[PDB]
Amino acid sequence: DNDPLVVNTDKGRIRGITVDAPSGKKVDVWLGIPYAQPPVGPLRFRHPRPAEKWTGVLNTTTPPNSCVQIVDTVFGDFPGATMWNPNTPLSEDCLYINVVAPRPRPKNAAVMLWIFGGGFYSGTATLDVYDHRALASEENVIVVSLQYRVASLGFLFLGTPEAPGNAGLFDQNLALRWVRDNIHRFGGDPSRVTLFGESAGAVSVSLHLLSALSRDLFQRAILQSGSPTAPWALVSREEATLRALRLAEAVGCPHEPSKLSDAVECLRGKDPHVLVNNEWGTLGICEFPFVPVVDGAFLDETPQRSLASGRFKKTEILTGSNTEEGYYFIIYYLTELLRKEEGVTVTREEFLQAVRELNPYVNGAARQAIVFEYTDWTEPDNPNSNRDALDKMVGDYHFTCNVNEFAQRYAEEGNNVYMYLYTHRSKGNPWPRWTGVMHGDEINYVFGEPLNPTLGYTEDEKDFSRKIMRYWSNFAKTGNPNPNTASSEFPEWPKHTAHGRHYLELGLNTSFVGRGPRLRQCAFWKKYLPQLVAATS
């Protein structure tokens, strides 16, 4: 076989297809490569097995199945909500990898591996917003994405070997070995693999930097709006079992903590869709039913202890937060107030209501410590301020501050860190204006969506997209985002240093550099508030 579009992997040979990128540039794609046996029947909830070797030529020409998950309807066929909806058929057999090489195909090049994230309950590598064609063609990089098991199918934990937990993470781990073993045949470098993700993507990518098993399976990491030290990232093993036994109860299975083997076997029987729909009990804002847990194999300790002791891969890190993280989550949660319409506001009374509902676990000697910190004292009753104040307290505690912590611990262990604050809101953003730049807005720009002519992105937005695609790309290459011009000295993007803590503002005409972001509020949630709760309890 002299055919460039057929490739012989360890488990057999596959046939790809040449496709046009929206830009018009040509790339080679391999879509739906099985990296594991379908985790069905006795294999559900369990760690994945490598794929059974196949005979003949297999067609990897079309986008694979998305894993079984819930879909978002709460806004009907709104373009803003439907972009995160799975665009392929939902199946238990979802374990596949997608490889996209640029044309001409390089002999040995950089590898960028995208781990999607849906709060560990949803998502797929097949989303339109994650399109490898624009990124691979413009930056000349091998772009790879994977499907990992999600929700209770991926993250159910009972301590038993029939449900050991972290199945989704072991999925990713196995997919990383596939890359290590098979990427050079697509023209990549097994040692130059750079992992990058958003939400759980970042939380996943981070957990590979920590994990013993996936330690030497990649080179660098890019983390978007997520860290392993976030509140929603992990659950206690004691709770994870209760969440599992509650799911057993809710679905009509044996829920007794006495006999665990009864519970898992009954669960294996039930339909996958009824299983994922019964995960949602009483949960506050920004907390999810089934997520990573410290299993003993993938992780043998909590990420907090790993970070403290300094047990993580010595690597360059590119990480950052968006300006308005919370808004997205305060829309779905707390849906009464702050609905999907233009010009919404919040009265001082409604604000005071919200901080109780958004922080239900604090003693009230902490509530007004929050309200004093998160109110604008130049004009306290301002309806705009009180609304934006909700986004900040959610955004900072659940997202922004946790990113800062991980970035600092990496910086002070002598690693090069690059911190960003993404401030750009699209002109064509479908969501209301007040939302501003929400959680996951940068994705469209890192993947080169503005370079699509069929979409009406302004000419400046197309430049901006190419700019951050460059930053991202040559970081995966060189360990540094700075372009060759000004790479020699006084960078556009300074290093996030332990004491300096600098970040770059990613916006349309701003090259502004600050320190943080939001160091005061981070000091609030990390230092002041915890010791106050101690002193009042």
- C-alpha to C-alpha distance for 170 and 149, rounded to whole angstroms: 9
- Residues 132, 208, 424, 439: which is the catalytic one? 439
Select from 85, 92, 35, 89 the least CA-distant residue to 62.
Answer: 89
Catalytic (active site) residue 511: no
- C-alpha to C-alpha distance for 271 and 276, rounded to whole angstroms: 9
With binding defined as CB under 8 A, does residue 523 bind a copy of itself? yes
Q: Where are the alpha helices (DSSP H) in 359-430?
A: 367-373, 383-395, 401-411
With binding defined as CB under 5 A, does residue 69 bind Na ion? no
Whichever of 16 and 481 has its CB closer to ligand NAG, that residue is 16
Residues 6+ apart with CB under 8 A from 527: none
- C-alpha to C-alpha distance for 438 and 86, rounded to whole angstroms: 20
Count the residues of the shown chain that bind a copy of itself, applying the rule CB under 8 A. Answer: 22
Select from 457, 179, 488, 518 the least CA-distant residue to 324.
Answer: 518
Footprint of Na ion on 250-289 (CB under 5 A): none
With binding defined as CB under 6 A, does residue 335 bind ligand NAG? no
- Residues 152, 199, 214, 385: which is the catalytic one? 199
* Separation in Å, CA 220 to CA 122, 186, 237, 477: 25, 20, 30, 9
Catalytic (active site) residue 199: yes
- C-alpha to C-alpha distance for 190 and 182, rounded to whole angstroms: 8
C-beta separation of 351 from 389 below 8 A: yes
With binding defined as CB under 5 A, does residue 199 bind Na ion? yes
Q: Which two tokens stand for residue 396?
A: 């900072």
Whichever of 72 and 373 has its CB closer to a copy of itself, that residue is 373
- H or E element: which one contains 193? strand 188-198
With binding defined as CB under 8 A, does residue 520 bind a copy of itself? yes
With binding defined as CB under 8 A, does residue 380 bind a copy of itself? yes
Site string for Na ion, 115-134 (x = CB under 5 A): ----x---------------
From the centroid of its chain, how far is CA 96?
Answer: 18
Q: Which two tokens stand for residue 147?
A: 């499907």
Site string for ligand NAG, 58-77 (x = CB under 6 A): -x-x----------------
Q: Which of the listed partners (Na ion, a copy of itself, ligand NAG, none) does 536 bind, with a CB threshold of 5 to 8 Å by partner kind?
A: a copy of itself
With binding defined as CB under 8 A, does residue 377 bind a copy of itself? yes
At closest approach, how far in Å is the CB of 521 from a copy of itself? 9
At closest approach, how far in Å is the CB of 379 from a copy of itself? 8
Whose tokens are 């519970």? That residue is 263
With binding defined as CB under 6 A, does residue 17 bind ligand NAG? yes
Q: Which of the listed partners (Na ion, ligand NAG, a copy of itself, none) does 520 bind, with a CB threshold of 5 to 8 Å by partner kind?
A: a copy of itself
Crossing angle of helices 383-395 and 348-358, in 10° steps, is: 10
- C-alpha to C-alpha distance for 66 and 146, rounded to whole angstroms: 10
Footprint of ligand NAG on 21-60 (CB under 6 A): 59
Instruction: Give the one residue of 4, 13, 15, 277 binding ligand NAG; rule: CB under 6 A.
Output: 15
C-beta separation of 69 from 43 below 8 A: no
Site string for ligand NAG, 500-519 (x = CB under 6 A): ---------x----------
Catalytic (active site) residue 256: no
- Residue numbers annotated as active site: 199, 325, 439
Instruction: Give me the residues that bind ligand NAG (CB under 6 A), please.
Output: 15, 17, 59, 61, 509
Interface with a copy of itself by CB under 8 A: which residues? Answer: 365, 368-369, 372, 377-380, 499, 515-516, 519-520, 522-524, 527-528, 531-532, 535-536
